């Protein structure tokens, strides 16, 4: 959200008045505005982000670094060029073969002309070369391995969802990544970085006292369990010990979605690509129960509720235990003055802040007068509006922040005591939660299977999740497959043979890569990554785990056993490790239902929105469809005695509770409003039967 570019707002063009051409990508966007990352809604092209290396001209333009090349020799004078002076010149690329002395070995080189043209230049006229690859790409898009193999659509979807991950309680780093996860996380702000080089004095879970190398000492107050702007947690755990020596610019405390300094937006899971039982039908995803058992996907959600004490004509709002008509058992968790105490587990619809308002006196109905005569109860004239926790929200109560007008706190006008309650819960994973890898392969959770009924590997390891095959080739996003093969390679660990020296596929493969320990972190840069030769040849030599167990062949597949039937599958199945995410489109944040709730004020329609109980808009095309069936009575039902028949709703509720026939639908309110407005507009509207 920082580093974000927008074309809409005051001064600039609006949304709907703007045409199609400004949504597109001119070739001047290259190196400046990322042609991948944008929202895919009704804002496409209007909202992009910067490139990695972009920088703003003091004239408000977007300058761009270039390695200038002189006489064929690439220099190291980095020149910040802007768009117009880009068109003055002609620029070669990062994948240009250098002779380690600047010079190109190709006589014919790829190059970019001013109008976006690409030629094979004779290798003398080029005056600028790119500073690196991936100069075109944004930050978040440059966190996707194998980008060059994915089509731009699913890559756009994956990069757009990658800002929608939630913080887990563990935050484990990926095996496979880019070179961006460290630098982007130290620029992220939510990582406590050791400012000055020194030595550790004393740690805690809340602060680290650092001992600087000359005199002074400094604490760093950790933010633990802070509520973010969308309910997600903001824990900051320290990662160093007491005798450690740190330096300036070093990570000293991980943040929400970080591990050991670098980014961690999810977990690493053993995945297979078989279609299983129709549960993974059309991007549906199944899981293991082990993700529930080990809390592998578990986020802490923190919701802050609020209620105020306010002045009125009839008196003043009062926060107390005196809350007329009610058991004493439901007033157990609250304190002496109405608010609950820290750690009290709440359900849906309980009492949080015991608060009552004065109401005054009206006439009593004589039946109520009889009942109060019988029971010896008073009128109890004050009316109770306590802060009740809304539907489907529960969990612990962490913290209470309370403000008071009498305690000289600043408050808005007419307000006497403002109390806020931090409610928190620890949501597990659940069928319906939205998961996605880093490639646009998204989907709800189809079925959380138990741990035994699972296609499991020959060692007895079960797979964790199972994607679908059929969604892969038609979406043109095989970077997930390359990530799967590379993930199994990195999990298993390898050491190629050098007995006849370097095998021919691993020639361009640089050193300290011929071996690898199991569960070692690797990184592919974005447009300089593993090639087909390197990945396949490294997949060929993939040393066994505990016994002599080459589990996965050279092809990348393996023989699975059905946990349900017991027979082996007749064909080898692609397996491996993919790094996936949990997204903030959870079920409880979207589940919504209503029998009878709040209505409107102006119209008599039911009020809508998940903040209320809320209704569902039976829209226009719905009316078209039910006309198309011809179900006229049910259309009458939906249009009249669920929306605006004010005298009809109560009689329908009564007839249901009595178990009787549903009565005739009366005249809706919205017609009568139209009738009164047309009468108000000096038009005698006449209604006639004959």
């Amino acid at each position: 959200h920082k580093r974000r570019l927008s074309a809409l707002g005051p001064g600039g063009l609006s949304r709907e008045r703007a045409g199609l051409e400004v949504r597109d990508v001119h070739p001047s966007h290259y190196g400046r505005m990322c042609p991948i990352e944008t929202p895919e809604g009704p804002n496409i092209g209007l909202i992009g982000s910067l490139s990695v290396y972009a920088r703003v001209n003091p004239f408000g333009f977007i300058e761009t670094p270039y390695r200038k090349v002189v006489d064929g020799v690439v220099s190291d004078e980095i020149v910040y060029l802007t768009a117009d002076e880009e068109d003055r010149h002609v620029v070669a690329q990062a994948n240009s073969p250098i002779d380690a002395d600047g010079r190109f070995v190709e006589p014919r080189v790829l190059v970019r002309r001013k109008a976006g043209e690409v030629e094979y230049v004779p290798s003398s006229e080029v005056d600028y070369m790119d500073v690196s690859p991936r100069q075109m790409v944004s930050v978040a898009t440059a966190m996707i391995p194998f980008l060059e193999h994915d089509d731009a659509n699913r890559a756009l979807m994956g990069a757009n969802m990658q800002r929608q991950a939630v913080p887990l309680v563990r935050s484990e780093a990926p095996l496979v990544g880019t070179g961006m996860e460290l630098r982007a996380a130290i620029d992220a702000g939510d990582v406590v970085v050791a400012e000055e080089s020194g030595v550790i004095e004393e740690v805690s879970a809340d602060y680290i006292t650092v001992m600087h190398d000359n005199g002074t000492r400094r604490t760093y107050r950790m933010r633990k369990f802070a509520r973010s702007n969308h309910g997600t947690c903001a824990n900051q755990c320290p990662i160093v010990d007491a005798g450690d020596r740190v330096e300036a610019g070093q990570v000293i405390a991980d943040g929400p979605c970080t591990d050991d300094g670098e980014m961690a937006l999810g977990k690493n899971l053993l995945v297979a690509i078989m279609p299983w039982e129709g549960h993974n039908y059309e991007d549906a995803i199944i899981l293991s129960n082990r993700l529930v058992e080990e809390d592998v996907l578990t986020s802490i959600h923190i919701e802050e509720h609020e209620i105020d004490a306010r002045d009125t004509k009839l008196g003043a709002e009062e926060i107390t235990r005196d809350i007329p008509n009610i058991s004493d058992e439901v007033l157990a968790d609250l304190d002496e003055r109405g608010i609950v105490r820290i750690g009290a587990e709440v359900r849906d619809g309980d009492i949080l802040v015991g608060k009552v308002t004065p109401k005054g006196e009206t006439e009593l109905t004589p039946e109520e007068r009889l009942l109060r005569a019988i029971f010896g109860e008073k009128a109890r004239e004050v009316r109770d509006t306590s802060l009740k926790v809304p539907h489907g929200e529960s969990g612990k109560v962490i913290g209470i922040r309370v403000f008071s007008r009498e305690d000289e706190d600043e408050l808005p006008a007419g307000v006497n005591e403002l109390v806020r309650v931090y409610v928190a819960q620890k949501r597990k994973i659940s069928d319906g939660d939205k998961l996605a890898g880093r490639h646009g392969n998204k989907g709800v959770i189809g079925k959380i299977l138990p741990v035994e009924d699972m296609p499991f590997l020959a060692d007895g390891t079960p797979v964790d999740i199972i994607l679908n095959t059929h969604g892969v080739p038609r979406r043109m996003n095989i970077g997930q497959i390359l990530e799967t093969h590379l993930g199994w390679c990195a999990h298993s660990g390898w050491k190629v043979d050098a007995a006849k020296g370097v095998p021919d596929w691993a020639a361009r493969l640089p050193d300290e890569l011929l071996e690898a320990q199991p569960n070692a972190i690797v990184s592919t840069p974005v447009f300089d990554g593993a090639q087909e030769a390197e990945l396949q040849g490294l997949l060929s030599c993939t040393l066994p785990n505990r016994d002599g167990d080459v589990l996965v062949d050279a092809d990348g597949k393996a023989m699975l056993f059905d946990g349900r039937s017991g027979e082996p599958f007749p064909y080898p199945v692609t397996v491996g490790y993919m790094y996936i995410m949990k997204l903030h489109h959870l079920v409880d944040d979207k589940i919504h239902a209503r029998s009878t709730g709040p209505y409107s004020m102006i119209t008599q329609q039911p009020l809508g929105g998940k903040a209320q109980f809320g209704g569902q808009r039976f829209g226009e095309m719905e009316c078209w469809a039910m006309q198309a069936y011809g179900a006229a009575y049910t259309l009458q039902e939906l249009l009249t005695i669920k929306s605006d028949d004010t005298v009809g709703r109560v009689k329908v509720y009564e007839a249901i509770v009595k178990g009787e026939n549903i009565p005739e639908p009366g005249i809706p309110e919205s017609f009568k409003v139209l009738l009164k407005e047309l009468q108000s507009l000096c038009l005698n509207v006449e209604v006639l039967s004959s």
């Binding site: 690196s132 930050v139 620029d187 050791a194 890569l513 300089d528």
Partner: peptide, 27 residues
């Protein structure tokens, strides 16, 4: 690379870039 608290993540970088990533909140 060249950050004193960086864990040893190994790369497939064939090309050695001169320029490092800037201070991304400069904007």
């Amino acid at each position: 690379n060249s950050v004193p608290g960086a864990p040893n993540r190994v790369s497939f970088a064939k090309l050695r870039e001169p320029l490092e990533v800037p201070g991304l909140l400069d904007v």
